[PDB]
Design a protein around this ligand. Structure first.
Ligand SMILES: Cc1ncc(CO)c(N)n1
Length: 215
């Protein structure tokens, strides 16, 4: 399809963007949590900003309705975010990450302003859906096979893997893809170019975000 074609075209940045969110390794005989704790702090601040952006997609889905059922897909997405935020707070407490002292880094602030740019009614529905799909799908790709990979490493943390590695989140992403894909198959050349640039921009922001916590 249209999205699959863009991913192929842009395979290189898509691979770069979907590397593991954090690495847990042994250092000097201890488990090094520095990459995990950096990711947790930064990603929690990203998720708090992702919430109103999904809220804006939900509104658009209720008004810009070629399909009635788009709303329920986005609504399930935002309801998951509720459970996600609670999970993040539970992680912060068990791992001593104080979210009130996390400083959002450059890549995180850039990503947040970009989410703001996508919240305007001046942006076309197919473009907003592409961005929403992409942000979700990069987490699905990056956590794919996390259990089996994690089992092959000497120490693994299991929490994040349960969150984005499960079949429920995979199926969710597919259902969001099906919506984006439908919008793009009815889109003009101009909107199609806009959607592709937005896809590319999400991948670029994800590479930069990833670089904050790399091992
Ligand atoms: C940076 C980033 N991209 C995507 C997601 C999907 O939730 C996330 N949590 N964080």
């Amino acid at each position: 399809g249209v999205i699959d074609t863009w991913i192929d075209k842009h395979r290189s940045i898509y691979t770069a963007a979907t590397r593991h969110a954090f690495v847990v390794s042994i250092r000097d005989g201890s488990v090094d949590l520095s990459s995990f704790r950096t990711w947790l702090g930064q990603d929690y601040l990203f998720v708090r900003r992702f919430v109103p952006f999904v809220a804006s997609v939900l509104i658009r889905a209720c008004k810009d309705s070629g399909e009635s059922s788009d709303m329920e897909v986005v609504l399930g997405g935002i309801a998951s975010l509720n459970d996600e935020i609670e999970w993040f707070k539970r992680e912060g407490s068990k791992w001593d990450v104080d979210f009130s002292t996390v400083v959002p880094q450059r890549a995180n602030q850039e990503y947040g302003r970009f989410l703001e740019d996508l919240m305007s009614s001046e942006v076309k529905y197919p473009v907003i859906m592409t961005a929403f799909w992409a942000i979700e799908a990069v987490y699905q790709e990056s956590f794919a096979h996390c259990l089996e990979d994690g089992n092959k490493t000497p120490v693994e943390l299991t929490g994040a893997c349960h969150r984005w590695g499960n079949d429920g989140f995979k199926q969710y992403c597919s259902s969001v893809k099906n919506i984006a894909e439908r919008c793009l198959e009815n889109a003009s050349g101009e909107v199609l170019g806009e959607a592709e640039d937005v896809l590319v921009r999400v991948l670029e922001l994800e590479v930069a975000f990833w670089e904050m916590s790399r091992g």
